Specification:
part of a larger assembly; 6 chains; 307 residues; mainly beta; Leukocidin-like; 1 helix; 18 strands; 1% helix; 55% strand
Chain lengths: 307, 307, 307, 307, 307, 307
């Protein structure tokens, strides 16, 4: 609720003349002072900060609602002949192919006070208690035949919504907020730790027996999560409260993408998949991107500038 | 919220007379300046840009919300006798027919600064964590007969919404936003990578054993996706933030469609289908459309003009 | 409802001149004075207090709606070789691994009067009577054969929503409110009190027979509750009513988490899970966090300051 | 609907001067005068009364809408070695354990007229006709075999919502209103009156054959009702109508909880549960809590003060 | 819709002075004059009448919307040893127990004209045509065996909502409106007219073979309808239209409560339930409550007073 | 939409004095002039007419929206010993009992012009095209055995809403509108024309073999339709249009109920039900109730008066 409160009326007059202009100004309790900026990164991960400063006369401290819109590209890379045998990586042989895919996204927003003790009040993406629907059923039954048959059955149905990527706020202090976004499972039900005795890992095994190129047997496009074919677009909101005399603050948004290597090999008879975790991928493929965009927030000028 | 804020009252007076006109003007925080233009392409792919400039007194930089309404025609082309044997292409023999269809659409919007560092803040079509519904049921059971029968069943039901085309935002920087929209699978559940060892690919087989013309046996009209019979109509939105003294900017919307060739052959006994990918289609059919519409955004005049 | 009520108009006049300014002020019954502060803790558990003081002309006692936004980190800790045999804790052997996870969250808010008898009126998170859906079916049946078969079945289906964590308000007085948030069960249906005679506790058994590291066999990320991988974010609201002459009050938000140790051991043939309760975990791992954030609420200055 | 009705404008003038202030006051039909107080009890059962006096010019009697928010703690107590044999209660033996739990909550609100005949008009928590869904299915069936099969089946599905606790308004007069809230059944379907020939009462029997402490075999936390692990928080509303000349009234909110003792005993082979009703529990455990909070309602001063 | 219509502005002036006060009054078409009163009865059945007089300038007759909020206690009475054999009534023997329960509620509102022909226009609780959902399925089927099996099934499913109590308006004239609310059935499907050849009527038979006291075998609390454990709370509305010169009217709300006696007897082996109807219950138990609350509605002073 | 249009300002002045009162009147396009009356009948069937005259300056004719609220009592009558044999009706023998119940309700509203051609424009209760839900399912099936199983099944599900009483507007002219409300079937599915070879008609046959009085074997209360236990309360609306010079009109609401006699006889072994249609019921029981209430509508005075 933002009532009109009062009105102040002033008069601009002519030289030794009557009133030639009437200026009315309505005084509102809440004033929205909006600024917005954006910044790219070497690996094309964009961060845009939109800060609305809340000039509130009925407040003891300055406040700012900041919306962070981030795009972290998935970096879905395809490499020919990746580890067909051992650690050998020839581009000639095409019996195996590797796909670098972003297993878990990381987002850090850091508040760096400069002149006054600016504090992070709340972060909009918060962990919620996810609930399931449980249906427990008892059934009895008797028969006549003509001997007598008795049946007793238990059933328990558990229904829940399973997202492809789970976003969890792993840290939230007055100076920094850190969110994780972990891959849970595919729409088929396969997980990064899944393993078949003969078929390996089948997260993105397009065909069980396909006479196609190893990349052509890797799911891509609409068959995978939109955060794997495209990128991660987390909408975030941080409420900053700072003393009344604040001049400048710093806001560092750190984006980190850790990618694993889905290896699609062709054995003598059957296809196979192996998930090589981030810490095992060779450094030549840059499986861990850790980049940052820095903004300066001028509370007096009420501006956001990519510094 | 856009309150009235203040009012300014001026008086137009007659020659040595009283007040003959009173002009009141309410001063609003938000002013919307709407402009819209459109542009065609050689293959009739239209791009319309509707930019609302947000004149904000409570802002440190100019902003513009631009809605892109695009029509990229499917280019659904029918070719007689397409590759009945090898790479031979007679128009005479009608035992086979080719259908050029748009597997993947690609739309790029490019921000080209001229006078000031105009930046792309947010692109409305964003990748979302699409979730499925999982129901797990465990059922026990006992019997009486009259010996004793025991039953145990595990059930896992996964329910999800699968669109015909999946739109994924593959790039988003301060200067360029790229969306891709790829074909996922047909209404019945065939995919471009599907293969029947005796029937081939059945994405668009109207009849399994049909004594009709090869084109007459290819699904068309309402039996295929509206993006195949008609065209792609992506609604897009980009928020541009530029310094206060900005004069002129450029906005290039690039439309790209990659079309594959559904080859529908008639064998000795059965019908057959083969999906020839975009890079294998001969250049004479123009399987890859890559064209652009350029707009000039006058931030001072608050206009959009197709250049 | 907050109507305009009346208006007071005053005139600012020049020195021996006419009215050069008209100041109108609308007198509202309800006035909101918003203050907000935040405070961290040694183990990065943040507490933010947002107090809206309700200046009510139609009230005999001052009121304040205080929203507490808390982040209590899960403290999900991984320890190598945790109690492979007895109480021996080598970091060398990796046949077992312990995971410290927060079973029970505890949040206390304490109202400490200083000058006047400030009282807690209500606390927004309240215990609610959760209802289940019961469906009872009685089925008869007759047969013809050709002797005569008779069937009679009774079925009772119970459906309810089961949250991963149950939040219960265990105490609510005029001076302090205490909430618990206890782990109920995982999505798969295992509880800390569950026990398989051959497999132990399987709350976080990623694989029954997996040739992986013990940590890799412990469920983490999106496979567990967001309050286990990330942290607890309880949104809370307390209504404080105090006499008209109140100057200062104190508000102590106490956050406590009790963490248990899920032990994943590797036996000769099968994995095994054992949940060591909080009171049995050695003190070296800090299984019980109990920390506080103190705020001073100035009812005259209408501010909240972390003290 | 609360229209503005009229407005009264008065002028504050200077000493032998023009109008220096204009005071406008809008006269509304409905005026809300809000007061709120709270009071604790020796067993920490808080009662908060929030009375909104309705100054209505179009009325012949004063009215007050009072919202009562009470917290009655469950008093969930655990006692070692409760009645292992006979009435012997040693703390040494831990083959049995008793749980004092709140079967039934009782809330009385008493209106005590002092100066005028203050009357209770209505009480918001009212008994509602609970409806179920009945589905009657009649099915015929014939068979062909090749003799002739005849089948006839009747099914009756009864679906309803069963709360854990049922709140019933057992009394409502002009001077006092009494609500009861009795335990109906557990989420599993067990009731205080349930009895197995060998397994006893299984309302809170966590494990059927568990080698754990008797308390560890008693359901607690999220496995029980929130009114058992935490407390009862009933939101209540009473409309009071009193003559125009009323000065002071009294409002006594009486909170009562009756607790049973769920006894978990360990027999030679199996666990056992016994529900000892309130009148049988020894007085040393205080199975019946009966407290009251008194408020004085000043209709002239329009205040509520805990007396 | 209640528009502002016109405004009347009057000026209160000082003695030989300028205007010292301006009184504006908006004249609305519809004015609501609210009065409310309440009255108890010897058997603690409260009736509260809240009459809103609608002063309508655009009307030829006075109108009043009266809301009746009633509480008729269930009178759930337990009698020891009620008619174990014949009509003998010992309090000593406890092989049987009687429960007086409110089968049927009756509510009369009587309009008694005094000065003018006051009439009842509409009564809010009206009989509605309740609809059921009927699904008819016809199923054919053929078999292959390898002789040929043919199946034909007809199924009819009828789904409807069955309340525990059905409220029917049996009378509605210009001077008297009578509603009846009769018991239909319990949640388990038992009716007062139900009868088992050996088990009797099982409306409130808690245990089929239970070694408990007869009262302990009678369903009570949340296991029965809220109108049986608690009381009936009918919300009612009557529209009264009377000539313009009406001064006083009378409104008699008559509450009637018909109770039956449910008998739980203990035979040699099995329990037994018998419902003794209202007209057979001895007069000493007061099975038919018939009480009234009289109100005087002063249309001139626009008040309601219990007379 | 009813905009304020203009405002009309006049001044009441004192004798040789300044302006003492300012009269403002806002001129609205739509003016609602409300009148309401009601009338009873010898058999207590009440009819209430609530006419809102629409004084619309932007209209060429007077209009009136009339809401008719009628209560037609069911007349559910119980007669002892009705037609046990032949046409003999002794009150002594109680082997049979008859119940007079309202099968079909009739409502006529008649427009009788007096001075001008008053016309009925529309009647709110109108016949709607009732739609059902049809589900057609084909199922194929093949088996492996190990001979070969072939299955083919048709299913057709028809789902619809069946109310107890069907209301139909059987006539609608400019001078009279006639609605019918006929009984369709009970919740059990029995029809007035339903007939069993041995059990007769079972619409209200409470017990198949019940050793009770014949009335006690007849369904009553909540087991029957609310229009049978209580009465019919149809909400109706008629739009009347009249010339600008219309002075007085007449509105006659005729209410008619046709009652049948459900006879419950006790044969040697089984109960039996017979539905005696309205034209066969003896005239002594008044099976056809047909009354009328007349109202005079004064368009100048804009009043409704029962004549």
């Amino acid at each position: 609720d933002n009532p009109v409160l009062g009105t102040e009326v002033t008069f601009e007059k002519d030289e030794n003349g009557r009133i030639v202009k009437i200026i009315s100004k309505n005084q509102y309790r809440i004033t929205i002072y909006n600024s917005v900026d954006a910044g790219d990164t070497p690996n094309d991960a964009s961060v845009s900060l939109d800060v609305d400063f809340i000039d509130d006369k009925n407040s003891g401290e300055m406040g700012a609602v900041a919306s962070i819109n981030t795009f972290i590209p998935s970096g879905l890379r395809y490499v020919e002949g990746y580890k067909y045998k051992g650690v050998t990586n020839p581009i000639y042989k095409n019996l195996s192919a590797g796909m670098l895919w972003p297993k878990k996204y990381r987002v850090e927003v850091v508040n760096i006070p400069i002149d006054q003790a600016t504090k992070i009040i709340t972060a909009t993406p918060n962990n919620n208690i996810k609930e399931k629907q449980v249906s427990d059923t008892i059934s009895y039954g008797f028969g006549g035949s003509v001997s007598i048959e008795a049946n007793l059955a238990y059933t328990k149905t558990t229904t829940y919504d399973q997202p492809d990527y789970e976003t969890s706020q792993i840290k939230k202090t007055t100076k920094e907020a850190v969110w994780d976004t972990s891959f849970v499972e595919t729409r088929d039900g396969y997980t990064p730790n899944s393993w078949n005795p003969v078929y390996g890992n089948q997260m993105f095994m397009r065909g069980r027996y396909s006479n196609v190129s190893p990349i052509d047997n890797i799911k891509k496009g609409g068959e995978v999560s939109s955060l794997i074919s495209g990128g991660f677009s987390p909408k975030m909101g941080v409420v900053l409260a700072s003393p009344n005399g604040t001049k400048k603050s710093q806001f560092v948004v750190r984006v980190s993408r850790m990618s694993d290597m889905y290896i699609m090999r062709w054995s003598g008879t059957e296809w196979g998949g192996e998930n090589e975790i981030n810490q095992n991928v060779p450094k030549e493929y840059n499986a861990l991107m850790y980049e940052d965009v820095k903004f300066e927030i001028d509370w007096e000028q009420r501006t956001v500038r990519t510094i």
